[PDB]
Design a protein around this ligand. Structure first.
Ligand SMILES: OC[C@H]1O[C@@H](O[C@H]2[C@H](O)[C@@H](O)[C@H](O)O[C@@H]2CO)[C@H](O)[C@@H](O)[C@@H]1O
Length: 257
């Protein structure tokens, strides 16, 4: 049982899997209202009803926070729950399946998404990402929110949605900021459902997308550090946010060559 009502990180174990939950409001200068994130052994829930919001780093634009949970090592926080099998070199990953059920609710106009991501780093345990590293996101849902940078292509990547084998069409957005940002955004966003997919398909498309970059070199030698699952929300214009979610039936399976 884990309960947090302010920003912070806590570890937990879900069906034997060591994980970390972060009530991540990294780009929020200050807020009024309440946030509550909880793990009860069977589900992780998050609820927010906050106001008086403004960006911590205004000039970078983009979102305000990212309440999430993750498996592995999150560089920015020098943190991992114990017993984690990540990070591992991208070249060593044969497959990395992620499965989770989700139910996201939100006031109608809120910029928000259901996004999962990883950070690929040159060194195994960096404490930040910079030039030469990569941030790769996978968005299964979005509302009044587009990824950063611009769309550079589309990839058809399969996955199991609510128990059925489907093919998703994913727009790939790339931005060269302090690191390389890549976001795969599903054309038919899903607000509630269950998905199972292999992160390897996204790592394969990302590596190809960057095969001529002068910034990202030797993609396959980078370390796949973590797998975060959460909901980014907000924009420089967002003054308040009312939303919440429930994640259940979580599991991952890393298979290394
Ligand atoms: O900038 C450090 C900050 O990054 C947070 O991840 C951001 C990422 O920087 C941004 O490019 C993307 O649009 O959104 C993600 C998630 O909101 C990270 O979660 C923080 O821990 C870190 O302090």
């Amino acid at each position: 049982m884990v309960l947090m009502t302010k920003p912070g990180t806590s570890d937990f174990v879900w069906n034997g899997i060591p994980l970390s939950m972060e009530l991540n409001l990294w780009n929020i200068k200050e807020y009024s209202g309440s946030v509550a994130m909880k793990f009860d052994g069977e589900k992780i829930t998050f609820d927010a009803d906050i106001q008086n919001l403004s960006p911590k780093e205004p000039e970078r634009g983009g979102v305000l926070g990212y309440p999430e949970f993750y498996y592995g090592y999150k560089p920015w926080e020098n943190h991992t729950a114990e017993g984690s099998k990540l990070p591992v070199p991208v070249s060593s990953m044969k497959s990395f399946s992620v499965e989770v059920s989700f139910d996201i609710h939100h006031e109608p106009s809120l910029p928000l998404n259901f996004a999962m991501e990883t950070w690929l780093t040159r060194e195994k345990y960096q404490t930040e990402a910079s030039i030469g590293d990569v941030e790769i996101m996978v968005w299964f849902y979005f509302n009044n929110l587009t990824p950063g940078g611009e769309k550079i292509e589309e990839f058809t990547i399969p996955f199991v949605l609510n128990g059925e084998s489907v093919e998703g069409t994913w727009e790939l957005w790339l931005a060269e900021w302090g690191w390389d940002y890549l976001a795969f955004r599903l054309k038919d966003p899903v607000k509630k459902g269950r998905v199972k997919f292999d992160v390897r398909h996204f790592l394969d498309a990302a590596g190809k997308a960057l095969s001529s970059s002068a910034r990202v070199k030797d993609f396959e030698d980078l370390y796949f550090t973590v797998w975060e699952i959460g909901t980014e929300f907000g924009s420089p214009e967002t003054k308040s946010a009312q939303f919440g979610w429930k994640f259940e039936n979580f599991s991952i399976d890393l298979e290394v060559r």
